[PDB]
Amino acid sequence: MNIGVIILAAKLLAKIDNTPIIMRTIRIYGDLEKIIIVGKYVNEMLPLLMDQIVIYNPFWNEGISTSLKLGLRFFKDYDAVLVALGDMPFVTKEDVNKIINTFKPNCKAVIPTHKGERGNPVLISKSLFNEIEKLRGDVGARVILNKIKIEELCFIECSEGVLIDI
Template sequence: MSGLAGIVLAAGISSRFGADNKLLADYGGQAMVRGVVEAALAADLEPVIVVTGHEADDVRQALSGLDVDFAHNADFATGQAGSLKTGIAAVPQACTGAMILLADMPAVNVAIINRLVGEFADEACIVVPRHEGKRGNPVILGRGTFAGLEKTSGDRGARNLLAGDNVRMIDIDTDAVLRDFDTPESLQDH
């Protein structure tokens, strides 16, 4: 194993998607969140931790039967940073880092995940996918960078950590690392 945990951020309200929870929307014949979690489980990540928040019971139901750990972010409405901190707090001490996967990016597949895992060097390392010059997701944070997350708030996620010399930008030949689904129209266009 890689020594990396997988953290799937699945707590958001998805307000731009309308009344429905986009993570429960159909993508490839199943709930979008389930496809992301299945890719994480099939990749070189262990354990896979799913951070819930908005409609937590429905998200858990969509993932029934999968071997995942859950961490609940009661303050999910304050933005992604709280969910990121909740997930990081659940990472076992034995893990050298964690890959942060967004539950609304179902086009990120096992091959992409394992390519990024293969680029992870050490606990001080951050691995970021890039497509045509644009930073994408998922991102790997080495354990040595976890403390830097204390300064994050709102929807900023880990962006404040991505400017150091320890960041490895990895070119990926697909826009899957950039594509999320924020509206019902974007989902229809996939």
């Protein structure tokens, strides 16, 4: 299925068992097609993201929405995108399979949950792309999800990692 991970990255270079966190994050998505969107600290971590397709967002200061619109363009033909944050190195590989496997034919999105909280990454299907294209400001996943009826929102429970943003 056409599922592409959009890693958002405008700390991040803080090691965890000798590997900088942004790198831990990037590889929990393994074989999945992904693209890293980078702004704030781009120059500081660029040499660490050179094995990746990286898009530098000049408009990062203008709010997370600009990073997500860009990242989206590279997958506009995909069935859905997985919006992950580079900030969370604890999301499990299993958590990912979960969020992806539970993406059924009537799901407009899939939201991970842990002990009563919704976390990330959020699986967003093609049907919503257009919606996130109108998005403006420092808004993002929350704002678009509120747009759908709970009847069309799927979910599954994952490790606590789906909630830990370091």
